[PDB]
Amino acid sequence: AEEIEKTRRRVNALEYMTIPQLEETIYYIKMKLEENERAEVTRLIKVKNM
């Protein structure tokens, strides 16, 4: 019974805490990355104009 609860804890700790952390930490990074790519390209267009 104790082994089940220890295992249950880790299943829950991973399913509710660890994975969702990863899931949109990823989502955050990918959108921050695309945010900057689009920022840099807008910079270079102005620099070409000047």
Partner: protein, 452 residues
């Protein structure tokens, strides 16, 4: 008649040596081969004028093409004969009927209602949907969007609202203006046929814009619709319900134009002015003090990646008053329509409910059903985590309640028109399976009269 086209760079065109040209003025380019392409002044300056042609600048000979300035913005010829007719995204007839004879032409951008002249939304619009009319009530003159996703039956729900929506105790004073933005041919035919199949065309005006149409015609479509909508409402005294879809397609079109004009990309690639641009549309809804009639808007959009934080649903949410949300959990469970009432909300519902508008038990049962369905849902999410033995006996019931609530109450089918009195009646039946001693939102006076 200026034969002086200076530059052509992509979609943009510079016309020099002009006079009396205004900002956002509609233009007309006659090409060398007798073709006609309308356009719009983006930036007027000096003798020069930077215009954007709707159809594109392909095949145009600068030397032999002439440009005419029409001395007015993008306008819509309106009439009371528009009801029963199907137009394109620019007001042109597409339903092989007679050319409409406009009472007058109106700037599609319209004018802004003085807030001290603006009349607060009031009175009730029966949609025929229980999940809306009771918990999430559509008030006359309110903007209430549907937040959906790809593959979700928001087109079925749209058509269902379009033909079932009605005002009680009113004859032939209600109308639906349906605006289709950047949708496929087959998806447009679905709407058009269903409209004339149920006869809903006989009280509707349809502005249909396809996906392979110019992006400027796409961003112009809801403006064409709302112009005809306000005309019918404020100048003919009608209760107009405007249904628009897909607003995600609208925003993408705006993002395409924005990039075409070398504009600085805002958050997630969309224009920095997306909020404002959306506001100039959604705020066209409402009521005016001293005027019969109203403009009620239901914008429909798909949330990319089912992300409510995406600019398009997020900025819409900051503008509109409520939101009707469709979830894949309910759609995969065959709930029609798949409306999740928990994240859904209508801010003005109180102004369209209660005795004289609906029955006197509208408010109490709403609070009661919503609070109960919350416990039932959270009883279900407990049974899946800690098993069915972690549920007390009182939580037996809320679980079963929430299931019946979805399969009987929310799920009505895309072709079942429930009157509000039917809806409320069904509401009490579901509360009947709950012990009376736990209905603390509803007072004893209502319990003794309606509870079976």
């Amino acid at each position: 008649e200026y034969r002086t086209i200076k530059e052509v760079v992509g979609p943009l065109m510079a016309v020099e040596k002009v006079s009396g040209v205004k900002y956002e003025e509609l233009i007309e380019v006659r090409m060398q081969n007798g073709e006609i392409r309308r356009g719009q002044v983006l930036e007027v300056q000096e003798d020069k004028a930077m215009v954007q042609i709707f159809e594109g600048t392909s095949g145009i000979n600068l030397k032999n093409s002439s440009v005419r300035f029409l001395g007015h913005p993008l306008q819509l010829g309106v009439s009371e004969d528009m009801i029963g007719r199907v137009f394109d995204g620019l007001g042109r007839p597409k339903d092989n009927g007679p050319e409409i004879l406009p009472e007058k032409y109106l700037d599609i951008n319209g004018e802004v209602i003085n807030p001290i002249a603006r009349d607060y939304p009031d009175e009730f619009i029966q949609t025929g949907i229980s999940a809306i009319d009771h918990l999430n009530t559509l008030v006359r003159g309110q903007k209430l969007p549907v937040f959906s996703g790809s593959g979700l039956p928001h087109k079925e729900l749209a058509a269902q609202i379009a033909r079932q929506a009605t005002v009680l105790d009113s004859s032939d004073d209600f109308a639906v203006v349906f605006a289709a933005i950047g949708i496929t041919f087959e998806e447009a035919e679905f709407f058009m046929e269903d409209f004339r199949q149920t006869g809903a065309i006989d009280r509707s005006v349809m502005f249909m814009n396809l996906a392979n149409d110019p992006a400027i015609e796409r961003i112009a479509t809801p403006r064409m619709a709302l112009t005809a909508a306000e005309y019918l409402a404020y100048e003919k005294g009608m209760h107009v319900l405007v249904i628009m879809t897909d607003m995600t397609n609208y925003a993408e079109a705006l993002r395409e134009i924005s990039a075409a004009r070398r504009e600085v990309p805002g958050r997630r690639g969309y224009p920095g002015y997306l909020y404002t641009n959306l506001a100039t549309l959604f705020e066209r809804a409402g009521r005016i003090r001293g005027l019969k009639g109203s403009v009620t808007q239901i914008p429909i959009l798909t949330m990319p990646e089912d992300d409510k934080t995406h600019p398009i649903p997020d900025l819409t949410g900051y503008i509109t008053e409520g939101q009707i949300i469709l979830t894949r959990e309910l759609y995969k469970s065959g709930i029609q329509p798949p409306i999740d009432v928990l994240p859904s909300l209508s801010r003005l519902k109180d102004k369209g409910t209660g005795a004289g508008k609906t029955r006197e038990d509208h408010a109490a049962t709403m609070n009661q059903l919503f609070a109960a369905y919350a416990q039932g849902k959270q009883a279900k999410e407990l049974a899946v985590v800690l098993g069915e033995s972690a549920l007390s006996d009182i939580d037996k019931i809320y679980a079963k309640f929430a299931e019946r609530f979805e399969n009987e109450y929310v799920n009505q089918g895309f072709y079942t028109n429930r009157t509000i009195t039917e809806t409320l009646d069904l509401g009490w039946e579901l509360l009947a399976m709950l012990p009376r001693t736990e209905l603390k939102r509803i007072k004893d006076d209502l319990l003794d009269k309606y509870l079976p």
